DNA sequence: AGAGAACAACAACAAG
DNA sequence: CTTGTTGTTGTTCTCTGGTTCACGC
DNA sequence: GCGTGAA
DNA sequence: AGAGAACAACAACAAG
DNA sequence: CTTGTTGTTGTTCTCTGGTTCACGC
DNA sequence: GCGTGAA
């Protein structure tokens, strides 16, 4: 219990052997603080206590190749250890998933990422189920579903009908999940609204393109070292990319005109109306709050799609003081919010918002279909749970919640609020927490590809498909089922 | 002494805690076998022997930030520990160096790499002295020499006149070392001969460009996964790059015509004369033997520039059976070997070859200037060594070697041959081993940039200039002065 | 978001 | 009072959102 | 059969 | 070269 | 005789050779 | 002052 501190003469020698490990093997300084590094060092001081200080270390230490098969061993092992805890959440309707496609930068295999999301004990599960390569077959809808089912067979899940899937609107991905529950990713929808609305407001082409050519010049002339914050290029495939460039120019506006004046290249910025650049940054600033919100899988997120849409309608509210080109942008944004974003929502987005206890809003058109939807889903929950055996009814329990009153406090945690209410609401708070675990976007699959890319590197390029599948899952397992 | 082996019940648990470290912290499997990792694990079993198994590990383990200053501490420390062993080799004329310029792919600083090379105990030293950034100043000759002197001041070397420098023919780098000994890198020279000779033989444009467009199609059509060895693009900035592409096509020729026929794109290869592709690969095959030779710093290399030039003259010897376009290539290659490569050699290249004991060759035009050169260099060695005090003369000892007879055996190691001859030849074998430690090219600086790039990565991009300088040197130190 | 890294800028502490 | 060594705070820089399927006229 | 939409 | 990685293909060995 | 676990051999894939100075007419 | 050579 009472852990002993070593002598300072023995502790300075420990920061000397650690520094020499990072230097010789070319590891990052932060390696000395990994959760698995510490847990491993604790084991090796045990071996010194039992066997003494004269142990054959090379014989004790494993080889990298036997490490490579152990994580493939353990991957098979842990997929069975939870092959039961997983199959329960799918049965009980309370499981959702996100899938998407990615291709790696070296070998160029196309990949199918699958994540899983369900509620446990006041906390959310965020599992990487698998990253299976398509083996260079065409990314047709049939092959995708073929590789989707194959990932779920790893845990003895063969149904897939009770799992709510969240994807982008890729024509081939969309068709794969035509036979089950598919929710449109709201980060791609919000991105479509921005892309189209700027296509449709070409009055703003000249200021944006003018800014784009300043970034292009600072990179070609190797001048970003003079900025305390560098200027960012506009990459269309990145969300809110125009805002990132514009802000990088504003937040460095003073030092940019000076550097430009210095190089006699002052004509590249004098025709740029700074005021409109500032107006677009204030407008798109709230879009970044919504984007970072929609990408949350550690807390409920689907319930905020509808109120975020209202906040977009509020930002682009017509204003008598807008200039002509900004007035037109706000006009096109509220349009595409209607025909691009609202057009591709579902009762899952409204019902998730219903279960946000500040429930005063959609009292109008929606509580009809929401009650019709909520009652049906509490019905299948009983149907399933009665097979688990081998006054205050749901339509009442529905309206009993519909009269609760709670204030928007900054500490309010709706997910905690339903655990602390599972008593009075037994069967509805189960439907609610089934709804509140669905991600509002496919960002969990995006992050899986980022993690994948951290493994398939320049020097680790020979790593195999199943070795990445194994490392990603185990790393996700040791996060969701360890401390 | 007799190191104990642990129980198998305690050894399986060690490959389980190692596998979990690699998984959780996302480290490569090969991390379990680093020289510094093993030396570190040996220390941690000692702490378990002394203090027992209940040690506070988090308090014992250092932070990454205190690791970052320790390697900067140790870097200052070890540059003083050898600030003496280094300054001796420079004094005794037996030190050479290679310098070049590089810029990193993220922050884009220009860098000056400096390596050091001298003889010790039958083995060669290959030191990374420093990678100092120019801080975005212009890479003028004055700033380079300014940063060169600054790297040598780190070890209290202020002379630099006794150090033989080996660089490429960059106009600015060349001018920096106008005041000291500069030897032309022979890898850049050989590369100039190839580049020019192919510019001057445009009859071969159509086969090469035809091959280039097959690689371009296999990459665009994502077809390299069908090849057991992939096709390589021609990058002009890589040495023998045309040979690498051509061979990648030949070694996969059968499977390439089949894949092309399959895609109905068979017209991209039918006009390609395979025989001339094969002739160019056989010719350039020996160039790759010379290139990989010239890049050696663990064994003597400057002494092989002259006999490699002969082997190039021999490969491109006129042959009555050559076709017209190959006959012209060999004609232009032997030309540029004369006006590009031989044009930029020095008596260091001839004298280094002289000290290869199979010394029958240059008996003609060169032993005059070589004797004149060797006698002067043995003279400054005595001048220096007499200040170290606070029959069989050199001109005889020169000719005594000039009558030795030795056979080219495959095990022959000339560097070992001069240690085992320092007795009969005391003062000449010192000049010889001073000559035999000079690198034939600047590849040591190239490799320093490769190592640098292994540190300045995508996620380690915030690492500082002096932190890379420190890590590179210490890693080089622990290789040249440890076991 | 939610991952991996590094470090400038301070704040606490010790030795002197 | 100084320096000289450690520890924590908070900013900056990375990456995934991608490159061809499905459909309708 | 070919242009269009969304990645 | 001379660095960093991974793994297919076998070879040795053990358990059964 | 089978499998099932470990260890070694040898191949394949990375990167640096680079992006602007110096000079002469 | 501008094209050329070598990175
Ligand atoms: Mn997609
Ligand atoms: Mn990508
Ligand atoms: Mn160079
Ligand atoms: Mn580069
Ligand atoms: Mn995606
Ligand atoms: Mn170079």
TrEMBL record, chains A, B:
<dbReference type="InterPro" id="IPR003656">
    <property type="entry name" value="Znf_BED"/>
</dbReference>
<feature type="binding site">
    <location>
        <position position="168"/>
    </location>
    <ligand>
        <name>Ca(2+)</name>
    </ligand>
</feature>
<feature type="binding site">
    <location>
        <position position="168"/>
    </location>
    <ligand>
        <name>Mn(2+) 1</name>
    </ligand>
</feature>
<keyword id="KW-0539">Nucleus</keyword>
<feature type="binding site">
    <location>
        <position position="100"/>
    </location>
    <ligand>
        <name>Mn(2+) 2</name>
    </ligand>
</feature>
<dbReference type="InterPro" id="IPR052717">
    <property type="entry name" value="Vacuolar_transposase_reg"/>
</dbReference>
<feature type="binding site">
    <location>
        <position position="100"/>
    </location>
    <ligand>
        <name>Ca(2+)</name>
    </ligand>
</feature>
<dbReference type="Pfam" id="PF05699">
    <property type="entry name" value="Dimer_Tnp_hAT"/>
</dbReference>
<keyword id="KW-0238">DNA-binding</keyword>
<dbReference type="InterPro" id="IPR008906">
    <property type="entry name" value="HATC_C_dom"/>
</dbReference>
<keyword id="KW-0863">Zinc-finger</keyword>
<dbReference type="InterPro" id="IPR018473">
    <property type="entry name" value="Hermes_transposase_DNA-db"/>
</dbReference>
<dbReference type="InterPro" id="IPR012337">
    <property type="entry name" value="RNaseH-like_sf"/>
</dbReference>
<feature type="binding site">
    <location>
        <position position="446"/>
    </location>
    <ligand>
        <name>Mn(2+) 2</name>
    </ligand>
</feature>
<feature type="binding site">
    <location>
        <position position="100"/>
    </location>
    <ligand>
        <name>Mn(2+) 1</name>
    </ligand>
</feature>
<dbReference type="GO" id="GO:0046983">
    <property type="term" value="F:protein dimerization activity"/>
</dbReference>
<dbReference type="GO" id="GO:0006357">
    <property type="term" value="P:regulation of transcription by RNA polymerase II"/>
</dbReference>
<keyword id="KW-0479">Metal-binding</keyword>
<dbReference type="GO" id="GO:0003677">
    <property type="term" value="F:DNA binding"/>
</dbReference>
<keyword id="KW-0862">Zinc</keyword>
<dbReference type="GO" id="GO:0008270">
    <property type="term" value="F:zinc ion binding"/>
</dbReference>
<keyword id="KW-0106">Calcium</keyword>
<protein>
    <submittedName>
        <fullName>Hermes transposase</fullName>
    </submittedName>
</protein>
<dbReference type="Pfam" id="PF10683">
    <property type="entry name" value="DBD_Tnp_Hermes"/>
</dbReference>
<dbReference type="GO" id="GO:0005634">
    <property type="term" value="C:nucleus"/>
</dbReference>
